[PDB]
Structures are given as structure tokens and as C-alpha cells.
Amino acid sequence: ESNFGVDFVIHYKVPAAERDEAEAGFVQLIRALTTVGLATEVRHGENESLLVFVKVASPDLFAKQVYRARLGDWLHGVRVSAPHNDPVVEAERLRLIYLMITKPHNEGGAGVTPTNAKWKHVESIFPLHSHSFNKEWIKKWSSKYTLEQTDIDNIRDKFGESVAFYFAFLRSYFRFLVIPSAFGFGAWLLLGQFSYLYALLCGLWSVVFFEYWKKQEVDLAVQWGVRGVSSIQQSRPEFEWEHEAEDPITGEPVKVYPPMKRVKTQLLQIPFALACVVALGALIVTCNSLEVFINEVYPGKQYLGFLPTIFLVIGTPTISGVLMGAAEKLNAMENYATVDAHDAALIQKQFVLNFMTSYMALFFTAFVYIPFGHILHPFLNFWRATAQTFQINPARISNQMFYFTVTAQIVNFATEVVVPYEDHEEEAEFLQRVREECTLEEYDVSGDYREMVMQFGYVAMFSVAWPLAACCFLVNNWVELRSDALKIAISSRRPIPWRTDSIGPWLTALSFLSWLGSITSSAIVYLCSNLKAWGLLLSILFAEHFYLVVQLAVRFVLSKLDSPGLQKERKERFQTKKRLLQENLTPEEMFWQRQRGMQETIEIGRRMIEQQLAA
């Protein structure tokens, strides 16, 4: 049916082995929720838990909270002026309710942080999905392929701005990946192989897409009223501290952490990255040497020649997940005070690791085995000795790139394909619905961001080897598109509506991938079309400088596109300007007393002209 005004739900698992302090913590949590003005209902949970609903009860405290939040946004420039001296979107009430649920006592709410606080029993605080909206969206989406602006607006109005930003980025990427597809089809059908024109077109498209997405995200931030949200610093509850100090200039009571300890912890990234590089490169070299050996020995010259590469691609997700788990553990150990800084560091680590695992094989095949033709010689001798008991065609990259995309894409498709083949006896349906709702996994969006960034990097720096690859990606994205729509619908719980300004450091990742692709496509074209080194360096010069010039030109052009957000902002500025304008409509002395008025000044001027032109 529909919710009974329930705003947030607390799971609060209660085990029998720690009943006493669990009951004490439940009492403390109920008291802390009641002391801020939040109505509570305990109900019966499942799997030894006590789920409890909470909503806003006292309008005065809620009004104070929204006023404080809007004042904070005004301080950082999110809005124009102060709110009032004493309206709300659907996916905003949940935001302030979660704020008062988790924020400490010194800004109104009561800190019920599931980790920092003593309440170890609290582990999941979540809003509730709209059953009617979910059913309507599943019905409407069951016969739809693409996304429009209306869908993005609905996602904004329902699940905050971060999910809306992710969906807008996904739609823009899918719409811009079409030109890749047509260009690659034309190059594979007409241009031949390793075309410089295709590399130039791919670099131009990458620059255009990056700059257009920058402009589009700025436009969306201006239109959605979330411009400058990243300037707002959100305190991380899990931030451990050892010293409580004051600011020498303002007097912040700050839980300060010695920066030397954080620097020492960050220095552990270098040994970790070096060990990952060494191990993964050794595995890659072993696989490539075994592939070369079996190609030299072997009915299977073409198809049965990239089996090590296929196995490496198949095993790449497992190693990738392990490395992301290790990076997450390291980032948890690496203390951070603010949420945005911790998220940026985690994204940087994950991007570096995924870049490594997903591009080092292609880099070794393209740029390492041509100059360093003896690195795999000991491995070749070892394989020959084991079996007892060499040119390097550049085009090997192309086929390998195919075997690095289609197979993996096909495997993902196959996985999804394989699976299918008392309670008061008055509202118990709602209670059981919440019961399987709290068992859902949290909506994680960084994985899809990273996957699409890796796809963009593939298209940027390696689609020149196999132009059709982008096409495959597009098809995959289409299927993946559906896999995202239901993912937030029933496949995952409702995420907390968080205001965001952009996609984050993924923009910098995309820019770096664009530059590296502009270099790498030209390098591959020169290395495979033919060698003279000076030609390769001149090609790199031309590619990088053309990339920079095209970036500047595209920025200059897009600065004159007249986005709807900018014109809306300037119209609002006009309106407020008119509103404010209509709302508010001794000789030193006698030096200004010889003449005072109109006729006197006129006559002295006439006399001055007379005496000046009379002689």
C-alpha cells in the first residue's frame, strides 16, 4: 500500500549474548531520539533484531534545523541570501532527519552514529522506498531503453542529488559513446587497421566529451541549487582522534590528529603500490611468455593462442576485488577528518589499482615487448625446459585488445543470464516489507563509476587497436543500463539523499585518461603501422600538442553555449535586482559660496566666455 508517515528506520540488531547492555543502549537511543523531537515506534524485527521507526514530531525543532542548514549553505555560497528570521523538497526532509539522527548534540540533533558512538548494536539507519512509486517506475521502465531529463529529475526528487548525478553522467556517457561506435565501425570497415585518422577522431571525441560533461555538471549544479556543496566540510564519524585543541584564529573545538602520523600512514602506499606492480607484472610476463611458447609450439594458431590472456582477463575481477578490499582497509587505517577527503583518497587508490590491473597487460603488449624483447627470455627458457621433461608482431596488441574486451564483456553477460536458467493482523504487510528491506545491501555507486571510467579509458587509449571495441562497450552499457535501473528499485535499499556538486575526483581521472589516450593512441599507431625513434617522439609531440590545442578550443567554444542553468541564474539575478531596487527606491567654506544655483552658474559662465573670447 503506502507508508504510514515513516521517515527513517533503525535496525538495531539485538543478540541474546549481550542482552543487558543492548537493552541499556536501546533505552539510551530512545531517550536521545525523544529529546530532539522525533516520534518513535518500536516494532517486532526479524533475525534477532528490534527495528524502530522514527519521524519528525515537533515542527519547531525541525524548523530550527532547516534554518541552520540553509544558513550553512548560504555561508558557503550554495544559495543567495539568508533564509529568514522565522519550501522543503521530498528528498530533503530525509536529509535533515538523517542529519539530526547522526549529528552530535552541539548542533541540535543527537549523535546516534552506528560506529563512533557506544551503540555497537546500531548498524543500519535507512529511509523507506515508496512502494507506489517503485511499482509505477518498474511498470513505466519495463518497456523503455534510454534515459531523458525527466528521469533524471525524478531520480533527483526521489533519491537525492548524488544518485541523480550518477544517472545523468551515465546517460551522457551512453549518448556520447554512440559516436565512438560509428567511428569505430567505419574505421574497421573502411580505414583498415591502426588508422591515424581514427586516433585523431577518438582524441577529439574524448576531449569533447570531457569538456561537455564538465559544462553539463556545472549546469546541473547551478540548476539543482547544489553549486558549491563540496565546499561544505562534513565530519567523518569514524575519524579517530587523540587531541582536542582550539584554532589560534577562530576557536574551533577541533579533534586534531598529528599530521606526521597521517603522512607516515600514507607513506605505506609506496611499498603497497610497488609490491602490486611487481607481482602483477611478473604474472603478466609469465602469461605472455607462456602464450608465446604455446603459439610457437601449436589447429590452434589463432584461436588457441590467447588462452593465457583469456584466463588473465577472467581472473582480473577477483584480483581487482582483492586489491580494492586491501585499499579500503588501508584507507580505513589511514585516518581522515572529513568525509570528502576520505572519499577522494579512496577513489584515488581504487582508480590507481584498477588502472593497473586493467591496463598494464595492454601496456606491456604494446610498448614494453617491442624495445624490451629479452625480458621474457628467461621465462621462455623455463617454459622450454619444462616442456622438455622469436619475432614480435606489433599487431598482436590488436587481437589481444579484442580478447581483452569481448571475452570479459561476454562473461559478464553470461553471469547475469545464468541465474534465471501476531503483528496486530492489520498492517503486517508493511512490517514484513520493512523486514526484507533492512536485509538489502547498501546502494554503492563507486563501483559503477569506476567501471565506466575504465571503459572510457579503454576507448581512449586502446580502441585504436580494435575500433569495434567501443561498439561492444555500448551494447554492454545498454544491458548494464537495465541492470542499474532495477538496482536502486528493489535490488538495493534507499540511499541517504546526499547533496553533491559533481562526480568528484572521477573528473580528474577522466582528464588524465584523456591525456594518456591522446599519447597512447598515437604511439600505438606509429609502432604498429611501421623503426625510427625520432618519428615516435615527433608523433607524441604532435598528438599531445594537438590534444592541448583541441582542449583549449573546445573549452573556448563551450564557454559560449548558453546553458539553461546559467540563463536561469541570470534571470533570478534580474528578478532579485528589481525586487531590491523597488523595495528601496576658512576659504574652504566660501570657495563654494560665490555662486550657488542654476542661473548664477549660467551667468558667471557667460561672463567667463565673454572675458575669455573678448581679448
Q: Which residues bind ligand PGW (CB under 6 A)?
A: 263, 266-267, 269-270, 273, 341, 344, 347-348, 351-352, 355, 367, 371, 505, 508-509, 511-512, 515-516, 519-520, 523, 531-534, 536, 538, 540-541, 545, 548-549
Among 59, 81, 244, 419, binds a copy of itself (CB under 8 A): 81
Q: Minimum Å distance from CB 533 to ligand PGW?
A: 3
Q: Minimum Å distance from CB 515 to a copy of itself?
A: 10
Residues 165-194 that bind a copy of itself (CB under 8 A): none
Q: In the numeric block, which cell numbers belong to residue 41?
A: 515506534
Q: How far apart are CA 5 and CA 130, in angstroms?
A: 11
Residue span binding a copy of itself (CB under 8 A) among the ranges 243-251, 439-447, 484-492, 520-528: 243-251
Q: Does 301 bind a copy of itself (CB under 8 A)?
A: no
Q: In the numeric block, which cell numbers belong to residue 67?
A: 534554518
Q: Do residues 432 and 45 lie in contact, with contact meaning Cβ atoms separated by under 8 Å? A: no
Residues 422-441 that bind a copy of itself (CB under 8 A): 426-427
| Phi/psi at 57 (5° precision) | -115, -50
Residues 32-51 that bind a copy of itself (CB under 8 A): 34, 39-42, 44, 48, 50
Residue with smaller CB distance to ligand PGW, 98 or 462: 462
382 binds, among a copy of itself, ligand PGW, none (CB under 5 to 8 A by kind): none
Among 11, 25, 26, 165, binds a copy of itself (CB under 8 A): 26
Residue with smaller CB distance to a copy of itself, 26 or 169: 26
Residues 476-535 that bind a copy of itself (CB under 8 A): 532-534
Applying CB under 8 A, what is the total number of residues that bind a copy of itself? 70
Q: Do residues 88 and 44 lie in contact, with contact meaning Cβ atoms separated by under 8 Å? A: no
Q: In the numeric block, which cell numbers belong to residue 27?
A: 533505552
87 binds, among ligand PGW, a copy of itself, none (CB under 5 to 8 A by kind): none
Residue 474: which of 164, 170, 155 has the closest Cα? 170
Q: In the numeric block, which cell numbers belong to residue 321?
A: 576485488
Residue with smaller CB distance to a copy of itself, 4 or 372: 4
Residue 484 assigned ligand-binding role: yes
149-159 and 162-176 helices cross at what angle (nearest 10)? 160
Residue 209: which of 471, 466, 554 has the closest Cα? 554
Q: Minimum Å distance from CB 412 to a copy of itself?
A: 36
**Counts for the chain of helices (H) and strands (E), in that order:** 22, 6
Q: In the numeric block, which cell numbers belong to residue 201?
A: 577522431
271 binds, among ligand PGW, a copy of itself, none (CB under 5 to 8 A by kind): none
598 binds, among a copy of itself, ligand PGW, none (CB under 5 to 8 A by kind): a copy of itself
Q: Does 267 bind a copy of itself (CB under 8 A)?
A: no
Residue with smaller CB distance to ligand PGW, 62 or 351: 351
Q: Do residues 157 and 89 lie in contact, with contact meaning Cβ atoms separated by under 8 Å? A: yes
Residue with smaller CB distance to a copy of itself, 25 or 467: 25
Q: Do residues 165 and 216 lie in contact, with contact meaning Cβ atoms separated by under 8 Å? A: no
Residue with smaller CB distance to ligand PGW, 263 or 614: 263
Q: Minimum Å distance from CB 344 to ligand PGW?
A: 5
Residue with smaller CB distance to a copy of itself, 426 or 441: 426
Q: Is the dihedral of CA 156, 161, 167, 170 positive or negative?
A: positive
- What is the x/- site pattern for a copy of itself, positions 382-421, by CB under 8 A? ----------------------------------------
* CB burial readout 373-389, b (16+ within 10 A) else e: eeebeebbeebeeeeee
Residue with smaller CB distance to a copy of itself, 268 or 609: 609
Collect all residues with Cβ–Cβ distance below 8 Å to 203 and sequence separation of at least 6: 460, 514, 517, 518, 521, 543, 546, 547, 550
Burial class for 176, CB neighbours closer than 10 Å (0-12, 13-18, 19+): middle
Among 64, 171, 435, 482, binds a copy of itself (CB under 8 A): 64
Query: Other C-beta atoms within 10 Å of 348: how many?
Result: 16
Q: DSSP per residue over 109-172, as a string?
A: S----TTTSS--S---EE----HHHHHHHHHHHTT--S--HHHHHHHHHHHTTHHHHHHHHHHH
Q: Does 577 bind a copy of itself (CB under 8 A)?
A: yes
Query: Other C-beta atoms within 10 Å of 472: how many?
Result: 20
Q: Is the dihedral of CA 88, 92, 98, 102 positive or negative?
A: negative
Q: Minimum Å distance from CB 62 to ligand PGW?
A: 34
What would you report as the CA-atom Rg of the chain, rounded to the nearest whole angstrom?
32
Q: DSSP per residue over 523-581, as a string?
A: HHHHHHH---HHHHHHHHHHHHHHHHHHHHHHHHHHTTS--HHHHHHHHHHHHHHHHHH
Residue span binding a copy of itself (CB under 8 A) among the ranges 73-81, 172-180, 373-381, 396-404: 73-81
Residue with smaller CB distance to a copy of itself, 142 or 576: 576
Half-sphere CA count of 566, side-chain side, radius 13 A: 10
Residue 399 assigned ligand-binding role: no
Residue with smaller CB distance to ligand PGW, 98 or 209: 209
506-529 and 339-363 helices cross at what angle (nearest 10)? 10
Q: How far apart are CA 172 and CA 474, in angstroms?
A: 12
Q: In the numeric block, which cell numbers belong to residue 527?
A: 609502432
Residue with smaller CB distance to a copy of itself, 444 or 572: 572
Q: How far is CA 394 from CA 21, 194, 356, 371, 391, in A?
A: 67, 11, 21, 11, 10
Residue 60 assigned ligand-binding role: no
Among 274, 395, 537, 561, binds a copy of itself (CB under 8 A): 537
Residue 136 assigned ligand-binding role: no
Q: Minimum Å distance from CB 470 to ligand PGW?
A: 21
Among 395, 541, 549, 557, binds a copy of itself (CB under 8 A): 541
Query: Other C-beta atoms within 10 Å of 144: how many?
Result: 12
Enumerate the known binding-site residues: 412, 416, 448, 451, 480, 484
Tell me which residues touch a copy of itself (CB under 8 A).
Answer: 4-5, 14, 16, 19, 23, 26-27, 30-31, 34, 39-42, 44, 48, 50, 64, 67-68, 71-72, 75, 77, 81-82, 85-86, 249-251, 426-427, 532-534, 537-538, 540-541, 567, 570-571, 573-574, 576-577, 580-581, 583-585, 587-588, 591-592, 594-596, 598, 601-602, 604-606, 608-609, 612-613
Enumerate the known binding-site residues for Ca(2+): 412, 416, 448, 451, 480, 484
